[PDB]
């Protein structure tokens, strides 16, 4: 579905209402599978880290690697990034009062599927400039009931919580600040995700006064 259409008709209305927005079958099967393969290639080649230390012979969790998008063998990933930027672009000045002028590189995360997950947290608690978190999942035929790895977010100050499964070709958007505390439940199977954070012009500008 047309980026502009999707953005104007779904992402914007949805984001400003729930602060969270899930979009299924974003790029498509062939493309999704393509991204999946490149990601896996990076894993095989050994571009990921050993994983966040969880503990002699300790247990490591999520492994990461930063992808600019033009690295050899990451064309489709670079394509997802550009496609993500396109969506945001159409949401120009539509998401909150924010004015997105930039983003970080892509963070590819891999929970090895050895029980590790990720503690409840807030992506941007100190106002480093990130206003929107964007995550793309590439796990074909994922079954949380079997492999776990659910992403649990606690939107706003509302009771209860929303559960988002790292479904294949799924794209997710959510406020990065205190409004969206979240955690990644233990994953008993390889779980890949690609994350990109979008910067708000003003918040980022005044944050620069730190380096």
Strands 151-153 and 106-111: unpaired
Q: Is 177 in the site for ligand 4HG (CB under 6 A)?
A: no
Q: Is 118 in the site for ligand 4HG (CB under 6 A)?
A: yes
From the list 42, 182, 196, 204, which residue makes contact with ligand 4HG (rule: CB under 6 A)?
A: 182
Q: H helices of 74-200, where?
A: 75-90, 144-147
CB nearer to ligand 4HG: pick between 98 and 137: 137
What's the burial of 55, exposed, middle or buried (CB within 10 Å: 0-12/13-18/19+)? exposed
Binding positions for Fe cation: 121, 123, 182
CA 75 to chain centre: 18
Question: Cα-Cα-Cα-Cα dihedral of 111, 18, 173, 176, to 10°?
Answer: -80
Distance in Å, CB of 76 to ligand 4HG, minimum: 19
Q: Is 123 in the site for Fe ion (CB under 5 A)?
A: yes
Specify the residue for token string 């503990």.
Answer: 55
Window 24-63: residues binding ligand 4HG (CB under 6 A): 62
In angstroms, the CA 152 to CA 112 distance is 19
In angstroms, the CA 184 to CA 186 distance is 7
Q: Is 106 in the site for ligand 4HG (CB under 6 A)?
A: no
Q: Is 196 in the site for ligand 4HG (CB under 6 A)?
A: no
CB nearer to ligand 4HG: pick between 91 and 151: 151
Distance in Å, CB of 95 to ligand 4HG, minimum: 19
| Interface residue list for ligand 4HG (CB under 6 A) | 62, 64, 109, 118, 123, 135, 151, 166, 182, 184, 193
């Amino acid at each position: 579905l047309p980026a502009l259409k999707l953005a104007l008709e779904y992402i914007v209305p949805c984001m400003n209402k729930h602060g969270i927005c899930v979009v299924d079958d974003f790029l498509g099967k062939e493309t999704g599978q393509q991204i999946g393969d490149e990601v896996r290639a990076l894993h095989d080649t050994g571009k990921f880290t050993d994983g966040q230390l969880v503990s002699s012979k300790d247990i490591r969790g999520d492994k990461i690697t930063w992808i600019e998008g033009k690295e050899p063998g990451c064309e489709t990933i670079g394509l997802l990034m550009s496609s993500m930027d396109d969506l945001i672009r159409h949401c120009n000045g539509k998401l909150g009062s924010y004015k997105i002028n930039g983003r970080t590189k892509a963070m590819v995360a891999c929970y090895p599927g050895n029980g590790t997950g990720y503690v409840r947290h807030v992506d941007n608690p100190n106002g480093d400039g990130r206003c929107v978190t964007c995550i793309y999942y590439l796990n074909k035929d994922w079954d949380a009931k079997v492999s776990g790895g659910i992403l649990r977010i606690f939107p706003e100050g509302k009771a209860q919580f929303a559960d988002i499964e790292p479904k294949f070709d799924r794209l997710l958007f959510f406020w990065s600040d205190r409004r969206n505390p979240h955690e990644v439940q233990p994953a008993y199977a390889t779980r890949y995700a690609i994350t990109v954070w979008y910067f708000d012009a003003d918040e980022r500008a005044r944050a620069k006064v730190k380096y």
